[PDB]
C-alpha cells in the first residue's frame, strides 16, 4: 500500500520528511505532496537518521505546513522517452507543458542513471564542418563529440548556438534534443516559434527535435535537475533506437550554480568561492553521460556561462576537461564589434591535427596563430609607443594580423537583426585557401576594413572595389 511521510521541516528549497516505520524511501526517489494546485515533487537527497529524510523540492515550497502528509512514489523522477516526445515541450519532471495533452510513450525512465562504462567507450576523429570560419579553420568540431561555448554575459553563446542549430540541425536528418537550463523563457518561447516555422517541429506532421525547459525562473531543485531529463531522453535515442542525436544544452552552467544555491541548506561546509564541495563529481556524473558509445553517436553543443567573466572560476575551470572542442567568447572582442567574438588564441579542439585536417589546413592554422600571437605580444609597445616604434617585419605582421583578425568575423544569418547584412556561410576548403592567400600577403594592398564582416575571400575583393568607389 502507499508509503506516507510527514513534513517536519521547510527551509527554502529543502523539505524534511519523517516516515513512520522502517522502510525509508531510497536516496534519489521522488516524493509527492498533494497541493490545491496539482502536486509538489521532492527528491530524497539524504537520510538524516532517525527515520527522517531530507529532500530537495522540484518546485516552490510556499505554503507548506509542518506535519503535512507526503507520499512516497517508490522511484526516481520519470520521463517519457522515445519517439513520442518529438515536438513536445517537457518539464523537469517529464511532463507536457505545451498545452497539448499526455505524452503517450511506452516507457518512463529515471533521470538518474550511471554513465556509460569504459568498455562501452567509442572514439573516432571525424570533422563536422560548421560553415563558421573561426571554428572550421582553428578549432574544428567533431561529429559525435562534445562541443562547448564559453563566455560571459552577452558575448553571444546563445546566438552562436542558434547559428549551429541553423546549419547542422537542418541537414542532419536524425533526432535533436534541445534543453533550456536556466535561460530566458522569452528565448524558449522564441525557439518554439522558430521551429514551427522552419518545420523542424510540425504540430500536424512529424518532428525532428524535442524540447525540455527548466528556465531561470525555476527554483534551484528544478534547475539542478532539468538537464538530467533532457539527457535521459537523448540517451534513449542513442542506445535504444541507435540514432545520431544532436543535443544542445543552454546553459549548462546553470546546473552547477543551482547545486550551490541549495548546498548550504543541505548542511555542507562550502568550498572555494562558496561552491558545493561536490562540484567536480556532480559534474562528472552528468557530463560523463553526455557521450558517444558503441551503440550510438551523440554530438552535443553546450553553452557554458563564465561567472564574472573569470575563466578560472571553479565552475568553468572544471568543465573544460569534459569537452572535445572548446570555443571561448571574449567580451573585449565583441566590444571590437567582432562576431562571432571568439578567442582565436584560446579556442581548442582535438581535431586540429594534420592526421585529420591535413598538412596545409594544419599549417595555415599555426601560421595564422603565430601572426595573432605576435600582434598580442606587441599590444603593450603599440599601446604606449604606437606603431612608429615597431620594426619593419613587426609592422607588417600587425597590419596582417589586424586583417586576419577582422577576417575571422563572419555575418550570421540568425544575427541579421544586429548586423543588418544578410548572413554568410563559408566552407572549410574555402576558408583555408582564403586565409593562406592572406598569409602569403596576396592581399596586403587592401584596406583592413574590407576584411571585416564578409564571407570568403571573394567577398573581400568585392567590398574593397565597392569602397574604392
Amino acid at each position: 500500500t502507499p508509503i506516507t511521510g510527514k513534513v517536519t521541516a521547510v527551509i527554502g528549497a529543502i523539505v524534511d520528511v519523517h516516515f513512520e516505520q522502517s522502510e525509508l524511501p531510497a536516496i534519489l526517489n521522488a516524493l509527492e505532496i498533494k497541493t490545491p494546485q496539482g502536486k509538489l515533487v521532492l527528491e530524497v537527497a539524504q537520510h538524516l537518521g532517525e527515520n527522517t529524510v531530507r529532500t530537495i523540492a522540484m518546485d516552490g515550497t510556499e505554503g507548506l505546513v509542518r506535519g503535512e502528509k507526503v507520499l512516497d512514489t517508490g522511484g526516481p523522477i520519470s520521463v517519457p522517452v522515445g519517439r513520442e516526445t518529438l515536438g513536445r515541450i517537457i518539464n523537469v519532471i517529464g511532463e507536457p507543458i505545451d498545452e497539448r495533452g499526455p505524452i503517450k510513450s511506452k516507457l518512463r525512465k529515471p533521470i538518474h542513471a550511471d554513465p556509460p562504462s569504459f568498455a562501452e567507450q567509442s572514439t573516432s576523429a571525424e570533422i563536422l564542418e560548421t560553415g563558421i570560419k573561426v571554428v572550421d579553420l582553428l578549432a574544428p568540431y567533431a561529429r559525435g563529440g562534445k562541443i562547448g561555448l564559453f563566455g560571459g554575459a552577452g558575448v553571444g553563446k546563445t546566438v552562436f548556438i542558434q547559428e549551429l542549430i541553423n546549419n547542422i540541425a537542418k541537414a542532419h536528418g536524425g533526432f535533436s534534443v534541445f534543453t533550456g537550463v536556466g535561460e530566458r523563457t522569452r528565448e524558449g518561447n522564441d525557439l518554439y516559434r522558430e521551429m514551427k516555422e522552419t518545420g523542424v517541429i510540425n504540430l500536424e506532421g512529424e518532428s525532428k527535435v524535442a524540447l525540455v525547459f527548466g528556465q531561470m525562473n525555476e527554483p534551484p531543485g528544478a534547475r539542478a535537475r532539468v538537464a538530467l531529463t533532457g539527457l535521459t531522453i537523448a540517451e534513449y535515442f542513442r542506445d535504444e533506437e541507435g540514432q545520431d542525436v544532436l543535443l544542445f544544452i543552454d546553459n549548462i552552467f546553470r546546473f552547477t550554480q543551482a547545486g550551490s544555491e541549495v548546498s548550504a541548506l543541505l548542511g555542507r561546509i562550502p568550498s572555494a568561492v562558496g561552491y558545493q564541495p561536490t562540484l567536480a563529481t556532480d559534474m562528472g556524473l552528468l557530463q560523463e553521460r553526455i557521450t558517444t558509445t558503441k551503440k550510438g553517436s551523440v554530438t552535443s553543443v553546450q553553452a557554458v556561462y563564465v561567472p564574472a567573466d573569470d575563466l578560472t572560476d571553479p565552475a568553468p575551470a572544471t568543465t573544460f576537461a569534459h569537452l572535445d572542442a572548446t570555443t571561448v567568447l571574449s567580451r573585449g572582442i565583441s566590444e571590437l564589434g567582432i562576431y562571432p567574438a571568439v578567442d582565436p588564441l584560446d579556442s581548442k579542439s582535438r581535431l586540429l591535427d594534420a592526421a585529420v585536417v591535413g598538412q596545409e589546413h594544419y599549417d595555415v592554422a599555426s601560421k595564422v596563430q603565430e601572426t595573432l600571437q605576435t600582434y598580442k605580444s606587441l599590444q603593450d609597445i603599440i599601446a604606449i609607443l604606437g606603431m612608429d616604434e615597431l620594426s619593419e617585419q613587426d609592422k607588417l605582421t600587425v597590419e596582417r594580423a589586424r586583417k586576419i583578425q577582422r577576417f575571422l568575423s563572419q555575418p550570421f544569418a540568425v544575427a541579421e537583426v544586429f548586423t543588418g547584412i544578410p548572413g554568410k556561410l563559408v566552407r572549410l576548403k574555402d576558408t583555408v585557401a582564403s586565409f593562406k592567400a592572406v598569409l602569403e600577403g596576396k592581399y596586403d594592398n587592401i584596406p583592413e576594413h574590407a576584411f571585416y564582416m564578409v564571407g570568403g575571400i571573394e567577398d573581400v575583393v568585392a567590398k574593397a572595389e565597392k569602397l574604392a568607389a
Binding site: 561546509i269 599601446a383 604606449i384 609607443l385 604606437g386 612608429d388
Partner: protein, 53 residues
C-alpha cells in the same frame, strides 16, 4: 634642418608616450584596487569558514 626636425619629433613622440602611460596608469590603478579588495574578501572567507566549524 634634419636634426632640428628630429628633435621636434622626439619631443612630440615622447610627449604622447607620457599621455598613454598616463592613461594606462589610470586603468591599472583601478584594477589594482579591485584585486586588493578581493584579496581581502577571499582571504577573509577562508577564515570565516574555518571558524564556523
Amino acid at each position: 634642418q634634419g636634426y632640428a626636425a628630429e628633435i621636434s619629433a622626439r619631443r612630440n613622440a615622447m610627449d604622447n608616450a607620457s599621455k598613454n602611460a598616463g592613461d594606462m596608469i589610470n586603468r591599472y590603478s583601478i584594477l589594482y584596487n579591485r584585486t586588493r579588495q578581493a584579496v581581502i574578501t577571499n582571504e577573509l572567507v577562508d577564515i570565516i569558514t574555518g571558524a564556523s566549524s
